[PDB]
Amino acid sequence: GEVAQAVKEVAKAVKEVAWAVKEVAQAVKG
Amino acid sequence: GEVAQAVKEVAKAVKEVAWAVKEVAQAVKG
Amino acid sequence: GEVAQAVKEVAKAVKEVAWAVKEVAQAVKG
Amino acid sequence: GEVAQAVKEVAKAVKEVAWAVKEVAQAVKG
Amino acid sequence: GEVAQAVKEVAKAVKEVAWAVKEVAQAVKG
Amino acid sequence: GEVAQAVKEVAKAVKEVAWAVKEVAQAVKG
């Protein structure tokens, strides 16, 4: 359980990277 | 099982990063 | 415990990637 | 075994990110 | 212990990605 | 052991991402 919860924290952080990359794409378009 | 399922959630989030990066490439080309 | 703590260190490093990507977006906009 | 196989799926997804970043580099150069 | 040490190697590699992204930001600004 | 070896494969792939990001920085400079 404790290991699985820490791994889920990694998944959440990776999703934050994906959103930041989408921000870059929008800045390039603009 | 519980840990393996959480690791698979990380793999899915990483694929979302890959798609966001492809969106940057398309914005550069456009 | 020790494995979970190492995984949390990965999560923190991933958040640092997200902030660096945000800096790229601001540089492109500027 | 099952945890190791899930971790290998993460490794493959990370390689797909690397290729997408290479596409950005080619788009910038072009 | 062996698994925790390998996870710490991932954290170090992620920090190397963060620095490479900062180099992109500097190149854009320059 | 088997889990640790799979985690080391992830670290190697993350380093490949860092190198690809450096390629982007060089393309921007050029």
Full DSSP string of chain D: -HHHHHHHHHHHHHHHHHHHHHHHHHHHH-
User: Residue F18: how many CA atoms within 13 Å on its side-chain side?
Assistant: 19
- Angle between helix F2-29 and helix D2-29 axes, rounded to 10 deg: 10
CA pair distance F22, D2, nearest whole angstrom: 34
Tell me how far apart the alpha carbons of residues F14 and B5 are, in angstroms, rounded to a whole number: 21
Please give the span between the terminal C-alpha atoms of chain D, in angstroms, as a whole number: 44
CA dist A4 and F26 (Å) reads 39
Report the distance separating Cα A20 and Cα B21, nearest Å.
10
Contacts of F1 (CB under 8 A, 6+ apart): E2
Neighbour count for residue B1 (Cβ, 10 Å): 8
What string of DSSP letters covers C1-30? -HHHHHHHHHHHHHHHHHHHHHHHHHHHH-
DSSP A1: -
Distance from CA of C28 to the nearest CA of A (A): 6
Task: Measure the CA–CA gap between B14 and B10, rounded to whole angstroms.
Answer: 6
Measured in angstroms, the CA of A6 and the nearest CA of chain C are apart by 6
> What was the resolution (in A) of this experimentally determined structure?
1.1
CA-wise closest residue to E6 among B23, B6, F18, C10: C10
- Closest by alpha carbon to C25, among A21, E17, F18, B14? A21
Spatial distance between the Cα atoms of C23 and E21, rounded to a whole number of angstroms? 9
Q: What does the block give as tokens for E6?
A: 């390998």
Burial of C1 per CB tally in 10 Å (0-12, 13-18, 19+) = exposed
Q: Nearest-CA distance from B19 to chain A in Å? A: 8
Q: Which residue of E has its CA nearest to C8?
A: E11
Chosen for mutation from F12, F15, F21, F24 (greatest number of chain D CBs closer than 10 Å) is F24
Cα–Cα dist A15/B1, whole Å: 23
CA distance C15 to E17: 11
- Distance (Å, rounded) from C-alpha A3 to C-alpha A26? 36
Give φ, ψ of F15 to 5 degrees: -60, -35
- The type of residue at E4 is A
Q: Please judge whether F7 and E12 are an interchain contact, meaning their C-beta atoms are less than 8 angstroms apart.
A: no
How open is the CA angle D29-F14-C12, to the nearest 5 degrees?
A: 115
User: Phi and psi (nearest 5°) for C26?
Assistant: -65, -40
Measured CA to CA, the distance from residue E28 to residue F29 in angstroms comes to 8
State the method: X-ray
